[PDB]
Design a protein around this nucleic acid. Structure first.
Ligand SMILES: [Mg+2]
Ligand SMILES: [Mg+2]
Ligand SMILES: [Mg+2]
Ligand SMILES: [Mg+2]
Ligand SMILES: [Mg+2]
Ligand SMILES: [Mg+2]
Ligand SMILES: [Mg+2]
Ligand SMILES: [Mg+2]
Ligand SMILES: [Mg+2]
Lengths: 37, 23, 126, 188, 134, 133, 176
RNA sequence: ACCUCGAUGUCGGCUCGUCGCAUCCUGGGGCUGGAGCAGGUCCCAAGGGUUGGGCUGUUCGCCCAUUAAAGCGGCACGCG
RNA sequence: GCCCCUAAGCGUGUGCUAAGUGGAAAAGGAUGUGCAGUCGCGAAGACAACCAGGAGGUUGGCUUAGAAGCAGCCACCCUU
């Protein structure tokens, strides 16, 4: 889980969603899982 | 720096018209 | 891909429909690479497996007397043409359909007139 | 090559203030000094004006309806803005339906040169003279099978009938040069 | 890095940065240019960084133009002496940039590649910029 | 199933087909024996094979056509081809030899006539970077 | 929207009772209740089916329409046929058994773990490594399934742990 | 140089504590080029602990034994 | 300034805000939302999804022990 102020989709399947008062990136690949903080 | 920042921010009040003494 | 590519594609659609005689309505996404290549090699003696686009088939249906294909293009469709004899091509297509249970058959076109599923199933035996 | 119709009303007040008010009201000030007549200050509509400019702009001929008095005109200047893109002032020139005016037309490169080359357009506009109604909105220059170190000038541009090139025929418009390498890109 | 061969005056008065750009607003050489939106000084170091970024993102293709040249020097005190002495010596050269002035231009055929290169170049600048076309 | 290219006068090639086929659990001894017994007739040209594995681990190798690249190379006479298409030549080729190779390869190409076979082989040659007079 | 606009086909052997915002359903597998949102109106058509409607097209209503529609759909599906989730155990020495109404798992831990079945949900076992959980509430079924899955740490090297029926977990390899 | 030259006693060490987490350990979790032990990175978490000696005024720093550790700083570079 | 402290509107009409923004701040990140102008497609059935693929030449050449469509360089093609 990478926590950086800038999050963007790395892969093509990686999706961007809005979690509780924040942005987040999700995918089947656990490496591309990052949070905005 | 927090004190000076708060002062220069309160300077931007609707009663002072963006002008105050000592910045 | 490209508009020129699609134009050449429609051109070949016409240039091969002018040569083919019989055709049937199915879907084209057959199965994995190995068995799909086996099926292509099996049907290569009289037919050839191919796919195209809705707009492509729509613009190609204006050459021959198959203007009635507008209602079929009203929604998806895949076609399958035959070069040689059709009594065996239709039999092989029906065999593959009944064996896979994923390639549906809906009809064919012959003698400039559309035929129903029952009609094609009855005329394929003869 | 037909004229684009448009409405226009005289400005009841000039100056920077009136101009800013008109621009806020979605209008565009315009002058119509004409070919030796008294200048007229009109107010065009920004929306349809920009629409026509994006359709067939770049000195497009126009037909102003000034209080029912139809009159042809030609835009010979466009100062949009330094930063943003808004039409803040227009200068239209009467053509009289038959005058021979000289205007700059944009050139466009079409084709694909040798894969190991690169094309550079040095001049975008070219001084062209033709009938008022027969003003070409664009010019085309073809680049097919062109090798490196080739200079296509203005004189080599194929002009339509009744069209003339006012600028010198030696103006280098397009230059096809060997594709620079990593060293050529890093040594600049 | 870019640096003038010689200047008539070594020390200047911190060139003013105000108003809008009068010239160099339209793209002339390249096909896709970057136009700034904030007035600020751009250093030769930043110019070289942007140029290297562009030349690395574009390999064996296209051409890059830099419509700005850093020639205005900026002095600097020894950083430890007291206040009040002969004016410091120049250490870095900058280029007065105003909003609306095109800084860099590119002539790459691939539109998306050129846009990405210009974005990566702008990411190395101290001001906001936008990509425009010829 | 996999199509592997190999020379004729060889035996037990580890790099090309070693791990490409041994991983499937196929016997190599009798396979290479049959391959040699079958290719002993030509013994003068690289010949590929489209190995089609079965479920019972059996195999019936289908002798395919030689590769168009190597056919063009041996028709030109040079062993190493060019690296840049339409920018470097190696030698000239004869229409008779082109027609001979096309007749020998007709049983693999999707073409229908000798003209289409020639068109396809010429496309392959000009993509490789060679042209025939 | 696209889902919230469709009706809910109620089978024959089902009794639907709507009273204001609340809505109860009775079937063979059991009975359930629900409280539809306030900005949405639920009504039983003349054909027995249920239909949810929204008085506006705001974001709240557009998001709650399909939500409530699928909620009542799952409710009727559960009270009619119920829900079931099959699982599987992988890894040598990993076993599971049924002890009364609770499930006893042995997944290499020093002590065997026990999971009790709460109300409205039951377990079943078809093999020492194959079991399933059935119930009426899809939410409770999914919660219990997720709990049983997370009981063990996910191990991608050997795949040891709990897995769903058609689970496809990622697997890496340790060359050392 | 804006209060303080008609006085604000300046570095250490001893005693005495208070507070922030940018956490040395304990606690929980994500990714690992995490096979296991043992590690690298990040997030939350300040309730508690955070050794005794030789050199050198020393702060700091080096070394000797351990321990989970022998934390970084503000409090007039805390406290005459 | 007009909700109490605290004297005056828990004022009227049209819209925005879900973050206590109001009631600090930068580069950048971002399917939050309202308005307005454009462009692609679309009952000639638009996008996603219920359910199903991507051939022959060929493993295009250099590079590699090797690059078979997926370190890279050049072009980036013919047939079914
Ligand atoms: Mg005193
Ligand atoms: Mg005193
Ligand atoms: Mg913390
Ligand atoms: Mg406590
Ligand atoms: Mg001591
Ligand atoms: Mg302390
Ligand atoms: Mg002190
Ligand atoms: Mg009061
Ligand atoms: Mg902010």
């Amino acid at each position: 889980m990478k926590v950086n102020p800038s999050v963007k989709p790395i892969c093509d399947k990686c999706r961007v969603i809005r979690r509780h008062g924040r942005v987040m990136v999700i995918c089947s690949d656990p490496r591309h899982k990052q949070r905005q903080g | 720096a927090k004190r000076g920042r708060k002062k220069r921010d309160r300077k931007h009040s609707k009663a002072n018209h963006g002008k105050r003494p000592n910045a | 891909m490209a508009k020129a590519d699609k134009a050449t594609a429609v051109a070949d659609i016409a240039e091969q429909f002018k040569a083919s005689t019989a055709t049937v309505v199915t879907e084209y996404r057959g199965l994995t690479v190995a068995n799909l290549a086996e099926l292509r090699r099996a049907l290569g003696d009289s037919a050839t497996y191919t796919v195209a686009k809705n707009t492509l088939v729509k613009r190609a249906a204006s050459e021959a007397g198959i203007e009635g294909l507008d209602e079929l293009f009203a929604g998806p469709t895949a076609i399958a043409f035959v070069k040689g004899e059709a009594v065996d091509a239709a039999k092989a297509i029906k065999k593959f359909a009944k064996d896979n249970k994923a390639l549906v058959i809906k009809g064919g076109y012959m003698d400039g007139k559309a035929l129903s599923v029952a009609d094609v199933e009855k005329i394929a035996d003869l | 090559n037909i004229p684009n119709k448009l409405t226009a009303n005289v400005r009841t007040r000039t100056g920077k203030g009136a101009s800013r008010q008109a621009r806020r009201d979605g209008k565009v000030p315009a002058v119509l000094y004409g070919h030796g007549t008294d200048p007229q200050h009109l107010e065009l509509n920004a929306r349809d004006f920009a629409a026509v400019l994006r359709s067939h702009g770049t000195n497009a001929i126009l037909t102003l309806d000034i209080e029912g008095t139809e009159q042809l005109a030609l835009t010979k200047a466009l100062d949009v803005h330094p930063i943003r893109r808004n039409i803040q002032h227009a200068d239209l020139l009467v053509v009289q339906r038959g005058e021979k005016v000289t205007v700059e037309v944009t050139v466009l490169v079409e084709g694909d040169a040798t894969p190991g080359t690169l094309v550079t357009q040095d001049a975008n506009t070219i001084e062209i003279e033709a009938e008022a109604l027969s003003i070409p909105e664009q010019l085309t220059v073809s680049v097919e099978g062109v090798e490196a170190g080739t200079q296509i000038t203005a004189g080599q541009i194929s002009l339509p009938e009744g069209v003339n090139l006012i600028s010198d025929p030696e103006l280098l418009v397009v230059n096809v040069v060997e594709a620079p390498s990593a060293e050529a890109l890093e040594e600049e | 890095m870019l640096i003038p061969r010689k200047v008539k005056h070594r020390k200047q008065h911190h060139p003013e940065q105000r108003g809008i750009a009068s010239g160099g607003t339209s793209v002339s050489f390249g096909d896709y240019g970057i136009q700034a939106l904030e007035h600020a000084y751009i250093t030769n170091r930043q110019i070289e960084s942007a140029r290297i970024a562009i030349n690395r993102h574009i390999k064996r293709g296209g051409k890059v133009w830099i419509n700005i040249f850093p020639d205005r020097p900026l002095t600097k005190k020894p950083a430890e002496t007291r206040m009040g002495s002969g004016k410091g010596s120049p250490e870095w050269w900058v280029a007065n940039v105003k909003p609306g002035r095109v800084l860099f231009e590119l002539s790459y055929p691939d539109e998306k590649t050129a846009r990405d290169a210009l974005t990566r170049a702008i990411h190395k600048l101290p001001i906001k910029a936008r990509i425009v076309t010829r | 199933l996999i199509k592997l290219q190999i020379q004729a006068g060889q035996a037990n090639p580890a790099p090309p087909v070693g791990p490409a086929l041994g991983q499937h659990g196929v016997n190599i001894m009798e396979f290479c024996k049959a391959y040699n017994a079958a290719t002993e007739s030509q013994r003068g040209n690289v010949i590929p094979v489209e190995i089609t594995v079965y479920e019972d681990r059996s195999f019936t190798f289908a002798l395919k056509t030689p590769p168009a690249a190597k056919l063009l190379l041996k028709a030109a006479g040079v062993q190493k081809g060019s690296g840049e298409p339409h920018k470097t030549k190696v030698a000239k080729v004869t229409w008779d030899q082109v027609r001979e190779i096309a007749e020998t390869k007709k049983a693999d190409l999707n073409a229908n006539d000798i003209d289409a076979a020639a068109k396809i082989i010429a496309g392959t040659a000009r993509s490789m970077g060679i042209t025939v007079e | 929207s696209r889902i919230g606009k469709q009706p809910v086909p109620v089978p024959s052997g089902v009794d639907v009772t709507i009273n204001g915002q609340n809505l109860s359903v009775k079937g063979p597998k059991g009975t359930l209740t629900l409280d539809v949102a306030e900005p949405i109106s639920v009504s039983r058509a003349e054909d027995g089916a249920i239909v949810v409607t929204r008085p506006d097209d705001e974001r709240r209503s557009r998001s709650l329409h399909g939500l409530s529609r699928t909620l009542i759909a799952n409710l009727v599906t559960g009270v009619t046929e119920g829900y079931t989730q099959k699982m599987e155990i992988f890894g040598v020495g990993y076993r599971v058994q049924l002890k009364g109404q609770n499930l006893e798992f042995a997944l290499g831990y020093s002590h065997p773990v026990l999971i009790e079945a709460p109300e409205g949900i039951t377990f079943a076992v078809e093999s020492p490594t194959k079991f399933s959980v059935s119930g009426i509430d899809k939410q409770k079924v999914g919660q219990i399934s997720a709990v049983i899955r997370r009981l063990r740490r996910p191990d991608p090297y050997k795949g040891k742990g709990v897995r769903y029926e058609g689970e496809q977990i990622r697997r890496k390899v340790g060359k050392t």
